[PDB]
Amino acid sequence: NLYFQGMHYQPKQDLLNDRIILVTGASDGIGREAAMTYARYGATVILLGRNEEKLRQVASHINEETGRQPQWFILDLLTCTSENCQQLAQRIVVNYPRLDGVLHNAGLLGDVCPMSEQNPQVWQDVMQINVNATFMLTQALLPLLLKSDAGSLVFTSSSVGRQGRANWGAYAASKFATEGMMQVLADEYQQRLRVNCINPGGTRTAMRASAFPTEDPQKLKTPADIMPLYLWLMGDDSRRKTGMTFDAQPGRKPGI
Amino acid sequence: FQGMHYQPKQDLLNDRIILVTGASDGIGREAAMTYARYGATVILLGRNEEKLRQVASHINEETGRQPQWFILDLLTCTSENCQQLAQRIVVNYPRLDGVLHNAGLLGDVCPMSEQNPQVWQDVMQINVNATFMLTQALLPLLLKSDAGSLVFTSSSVGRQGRANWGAYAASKFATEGMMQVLADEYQQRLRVNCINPGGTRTAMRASAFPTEDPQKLKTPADIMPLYLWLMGDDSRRKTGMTFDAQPGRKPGISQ
Numbered sequence: 001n002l003y004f005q006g007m008h009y010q011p012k013q014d015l016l017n018d019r020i021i022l023v024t025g026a027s028d029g030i031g032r033e034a035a036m037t038y039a040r041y042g043a044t045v046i047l048l049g050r051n052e053e054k055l056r057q058v059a060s061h062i063n064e065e066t067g068r069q070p071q072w073f074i075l076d077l078l079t080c081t082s083e084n085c086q087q088l089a090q091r092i093v094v095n096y097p098r099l100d101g102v103l104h105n106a107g108l109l110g111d112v113c114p115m116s117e118q119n120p121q122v123w124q125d126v127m128q129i130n131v132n133a134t135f136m137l138t139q140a141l142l143p144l145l146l147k148s149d150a151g152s153l154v155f156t157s158s159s160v161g162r163q164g165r166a167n168w169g170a171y172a173a174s175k176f177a178t179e180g181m182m183q184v185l186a187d188e189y190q191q192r193l194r195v196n197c198i199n200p201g202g203t204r205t206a207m208r209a210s211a212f213p214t215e216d217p218q219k220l221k222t223p224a225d226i227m228p229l230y231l232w233l234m235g236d237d238s239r240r241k242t243g244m245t246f247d248a249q250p251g252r253k254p255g256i
Numbered sequence: 257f258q259g260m261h262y263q264p265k266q267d268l269l270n271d272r273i274i275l276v277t278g279a280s281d282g283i284g285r286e287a288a289m290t291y292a293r294y295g296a297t298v299i300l301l302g303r304n305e306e307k308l309r310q311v312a313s314h315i316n317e318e319t320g321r322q323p324q325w326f327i328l329d330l331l332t333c334t335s336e337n338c339q340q341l342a343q344r345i346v347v348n349y350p351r352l353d354g355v356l357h358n359a360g361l362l363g364d365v366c367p368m369s370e371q372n373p374q375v376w377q378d379v380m381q382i383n384v385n386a387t388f389m390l391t392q393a394l395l396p397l398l399l400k401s402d403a404g405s406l407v408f409t410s411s412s413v414g415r416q417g418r419a420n421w422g423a424y425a426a427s428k429f430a431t432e433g434m435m436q437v438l439a440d441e442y443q444q445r446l447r448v449n450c451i452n453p454g455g456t457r458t459a460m461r462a463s464a465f466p467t468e469d470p471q472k473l474k475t476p477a478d479i480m481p482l483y484l485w486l487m488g489d490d491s492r493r494k495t496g497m498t499f500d501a502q503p504g505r506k507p508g509i510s511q
């Protein structure tokens with residue numbers, strides 16, 4: 001997972017020209033940063049999220065920066081059905097000829113507390129968003145991704161998706177499930193799609209702060225700082241990489 | 257010699273109280289019978305009253321004691337139901353020395369592009385969510401044991417995802433993760449581990465591999481040594497680990 005270490009990745013500024021990339025959870029944090037970064041490197045970006053107010057602002061900011069205004073679509077992973085996912089895919093089909101990338105960034109942390117105290121309803125929400133709806137949206141978007149010359153599908157993992165640790169409860173279970181889903185898809189789509197996970201590591205975001213209220217967030221890298229791996233997985237330089245889980249901060253030791 | 261090479265003493269499990277889920281059929285049935293044969297007081301859990309009674313009657317015929325059974329449907333059980341169940345046992349038993357989570361749903365064996373999303377949800381609900389809720393309800397009883405042993409059922413596809421195993425794979429990855437979190441939280445208080453039984457002669461297995469000759473597979477009886485090892489005192493220092501009952505079998509369909 002430390003593969004990307006010492007990569008010092010600085011791609012051409014048009015790395016993603018003519019790539020159409022959908023980013024979920026795009027309203028703030030890592031998802032907003034990824035959408036803006038991909039657009040700055042030339043991509044046609046599609047924003048997905050649940051907050052119309054924030055999505056409008058991200059689209060406007062991207063338009064100010066690139067002269068091209070991305071479309072946004074509302075999809076709330078916690079409540080959507082399979083039919084809702086297929087209906088979102090049909091909207092994309094009408095507007096875009098393919099998807100060259102899908103970055104699944106949407107997710108829910110839920111409770112950080114011992115197993116004996118985990119709330120079963122929160123557990124089920126974490127599983128619903130991180131695993132089930134992420135699966136359902138993937139399934140709906142597979143035909144679009146297969147129209148790419150080399151489609152790239154990326155899930156969000158975590159160090160606790162590789163080794164479970166005390167108090168990480170549903171989040172850990174859901175990120176192990178994500179690594180599993182990713183491996184099944186990579187196997188089914190060998191030589192057709194790239195399918196991988198990214199573990200962003202500790203990053204300056206509201207989710208991180210909720211899990212570690214004592215941590216000084218100024219000691220963490222920002223979403224901007226961890227973008228090189230996100231760019232690499234969408235551009236041509238990662239073309240024959242699939243079935244892998246990569247750390248965005250290979251240098252960093254997990255924990256506070 | 258350990259794990260699958262284990263050669264147990266008779267009465268290894270004397271005075272151990274062990275709850276087995278999915279006890280009506282296949283491996284759960286064999287594990288319940290085997291634990292009682294090596295001296296355990298077994299509690300059977302499943303959704304089918306008739307079949308559980310039948311397993312209990314067989315154990316009675318073999319050992320002279322009648323195990324009790326309780327009904328729980330993991331597909332539809334709420335957290336309340338799990339707590340009610342723990343209440344019911346708590347009226348009759350002072351502790352649990354082991355819990356073997358063997359209940360599970362395989363779901364669709366088909367490409368991710370075809371996986372039925374209602375089945376997928378059901379597989380996660382049984383294998384992950386309700387398995388968690390039942391674990392939560394039973395933890396205090398396990399802590400009352402001198403050295404409680406909590407065992408989840410995993411699969412080769414819980415360690416390496418493979419084409420067409422969709423929801424089952426995701427759910428067994430989640431099971432390994434849940435086992436690791438639980439082992440970490442209960443270090444020096446519980447042992448928490450997974451068993452990967454490998455392919456064994458069961459109805460589930462034949463449904464996923466209709467061309468396979470089941471006579472080329474081990475039976476549930478054949479893979480019991482590891483199941484005994486994890487409940488007996490010989491595994492007391494072992495936690496956080498996943499063990500294969502059939503370390504020398506190639507995963508997937510038999511040749």
Ligand SMILES: [Zn+2]
Binds near residue numbers: 037039061065
């Ligand atoms: Zn931007």
